[PDB]
Design a protein around this nucleic acid. Structure first.
Lengths: 125, 165, 115, 144
RNA sequence: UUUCUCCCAGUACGAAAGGACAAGAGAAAUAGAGCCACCUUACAAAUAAGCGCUCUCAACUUAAUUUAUGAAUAAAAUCUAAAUAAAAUAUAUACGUACACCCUCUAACCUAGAGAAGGUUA
């Protein structure tokens, strides 16, 4: 079957520079595992994204349906939603800017959360 | 007494039974619309379902294929027995011969020769089974001058459960 | 919810959304076959005199049973490339967006708060 | 489920209020058939309030509002309510009267309070069992 | 009823680039016909509505066209205002649905209705 260990090994085979995997406790109603991946260039991002999906389809998953690929249009962020894991693939420099790992590793202590600001919306008169 | 007399069709000289073959058409039933309620599946989904009760469904008159329509024969079935006090003698006379109390509605069902059933045979909700899709046709609610009261048919309705009692 | 006009609260850290402005951020178009925009439906929001696509994450319209009704309309900005304009989302975001048809993984990844 | 009478819904209540008060005082009132049927339901429900008891605050408020003349309030709790303690319903009797010859030919009916001291109305009587048809049915009953 | 996505399948095909079909599934959209378990607005009545929910179609018969056989016309010719055999759109009614009953009517009641009619009646 297609599981966490197989995909990361496949990611290593295609030479993923940086992979982040965050488990989710049962209380939080989201995917059990959240995965973030780095890739040198958009061409590498396209290649690795295709490889995982092709392996996923080949590696059983018959009960599960085919998985659509999200973000292929973007050259810096591609994300594929599998049954038990979600892999978010981006460039190395793009990785630090978004800091997805901080969001999940620090559930409420992520620095970027504070960066959000508020506004006021008065009427003309 | 009349209902009990007609309870046993197989013990009242039943007409010959024929085997099934492709292209056979079974008779339909007349039921009363009790109401609607939600129904749940093992998948956790909630499905609104409508309740239909079959009341005093009996075969009344058989029409031969040639004498009714060259394409296929038809069978008349009526349910929902009604009072005899405020009806013309002609209607009572026909039902007296059949040995059954008068029914509210007479409807005609196209049935193949192999599926023909002797008149007076009691029909029960068990004819249909859960998992079978069925077609229900009924007169729409009348709204008065503004309408309605027109026969319409709904197709492709699945059966979820049947209450035998 | 968010529709033609329907001044919405921009729940994002995007520069245009984050910066205060005298006119509220309204919507100009709903990216659906129907004209009604609900949670998970792309919209053409307006911010700081600019037109930016936004993703609806909450609405005040009565919803189906077993779901929480939001008291405010919340949206998330999305770039043309499909990546979210903002890097974080402050308001709790329903997790049903994952199962909703479309590309929602990027926004969910950016949404730390899930209800 | 409600007839439209008077110049407004409040007028209907006032018209119903006046009709109810008049019935209590006299116990037999003649009016249009449509109006009589409308007021029949209220009259029966009021007797239930009377049966509830005088000390009931809601009944006192209801009795005071519906009955403009306050001398009737003792009567309801001491005449009307005691009389029908045994009965569980059907306190009011409504019957059809020939239409009014007032050039409008409105449908006329008489509504009366049962158990009253007024002269008995000419109620219809069913056929006697001595009739030929009834005797034949009696023979069938005896045989069975 | 119509659209879109998926599947088929990165397959068939193609040197590569690129990239299908048909069949199946899921989403919606609108039109039509309905419905009130829920939600919402009302009647601050037991009801009516959507902003709520469900269901929705088959082609006997062909035309442009493309072949086969075959004389006139000595052919290993010719689709034929030659005799002839086929294949091949949309139309539509072969195919359905619905209707079929033959009439008691003091009165009462009705989701039936302008009146009348219609339905109900232990």
């Amino acid at each position: 079957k297609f599981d966490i260990d197989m995909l990361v090994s496949l990611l290593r085979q295609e030479n993923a520079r940086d992979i982040c995997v965050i488990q989710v406790p049962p209380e939080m109603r989201y995917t059990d595992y959240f995965v973030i991946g780095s890739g040198t260039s958009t061409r590498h991002l396209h290649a690795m994204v295709h490889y995982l999906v092709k392996m996923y389809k080949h590696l059983k998953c018959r009960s599960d349906p085919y998985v659509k690929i999200e973000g292929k249009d973007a050259d810096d962020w591609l994300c594929v939603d599998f049954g038990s894991m979600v892999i978010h693939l981006m460039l190395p420099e793009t990785r630090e800017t978004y800091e997805l790992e901080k969001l999940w590793t620090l559930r409420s202590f992520d620095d970027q959360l504070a960066q959000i600001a508020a506004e006021t919306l008065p009427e003309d008169f | 007494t009349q209902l009990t007399s007609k309870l046993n069709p197989l013990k009242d000289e039943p007409w010959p039974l024929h085997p099934w073959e492709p292209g056979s058409f079974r008779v339909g039933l007349i039921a009363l619309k009790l109401g609607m309620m939600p129904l749940w599946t093992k998948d956790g989904q909630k499905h609104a379902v409508t309740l239909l009760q079959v009341q005093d469904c009996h075969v009344l008159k058989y029409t031969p294929k040639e004498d009714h329509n060259g394409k296929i024969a038809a069978l008349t079935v009526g349910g929902k027995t009604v009072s005899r006090f405020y009806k013309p003698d002609s209607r009572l006379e026909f039902y007296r011969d059949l040995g059954l109390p008068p029914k509210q509605i007479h409807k005609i069902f196209h049935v193949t020769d192999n599926a023909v059933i002797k008149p007076g045979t009691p029909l029960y909700a068990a004819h249909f089974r859960p998992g079978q899709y069925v077609d229900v046709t009924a007169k729409t609610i009348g709204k008065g001058f503004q309408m309605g009261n027109q026969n319409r048919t709904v197709y492709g309705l699945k059966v979820w459960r049947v209450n035998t009692k | 919810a968010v529709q033609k006009m329907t001044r919405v609260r921009v729940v994002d850290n995007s520069a245009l959304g984050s910066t205060p402005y005298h006119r509220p951020p309204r919507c100009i178009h709903v990216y659906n076959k129907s004209g009604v925009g609900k949670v998970g439906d792309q919209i053409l929001l307006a911010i700081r005199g600019q037109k930016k696509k936004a993703l609806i994450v909450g609405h005040r319209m009565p919803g189906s049973r077993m779901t929480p009704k939001f008291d405010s309309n919340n949206v998330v900005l999305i770039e043309d490339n499909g990546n979210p304009v903002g890097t974080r989302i402050k308001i709790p975001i329903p997790t049903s967006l994952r199962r909703r048809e479309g590309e929602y993984s990027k926004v969910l990844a950016i949404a730390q708060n899930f209800v | 489920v409600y007839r439209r009478l008077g110049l407004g819904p409040e007028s209907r209540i006032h018209l119903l209020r006046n009709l109810l008060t008049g019935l209590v005082r006299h116990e037999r009132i003649e009016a249009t058939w449509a109006r009589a049927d409308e007021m029949r339901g209220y009259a029966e429900k009021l007797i239930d309030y009377g049966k509830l008891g005088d000390t009931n605050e809601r009944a006192m408020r209801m009795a005071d509002f519906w009955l403009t003349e306050k001398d009737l309030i003792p009567k309801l709790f001491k005449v009307l309510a005691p009389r029908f303690q045994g009965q569980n319903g059907n306190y009011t009797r409504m019957l059809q009267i020939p239409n009014r010859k007032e050039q409008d030919r409105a449908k006329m009916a008489v509504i009366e309070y049962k158990g009253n001291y007024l002269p008995p109305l000419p109620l219809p009587h069913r056929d006697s069992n001595l009739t030929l048809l009834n005797q034949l049915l009696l023979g069938l009953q005896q045989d069975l």
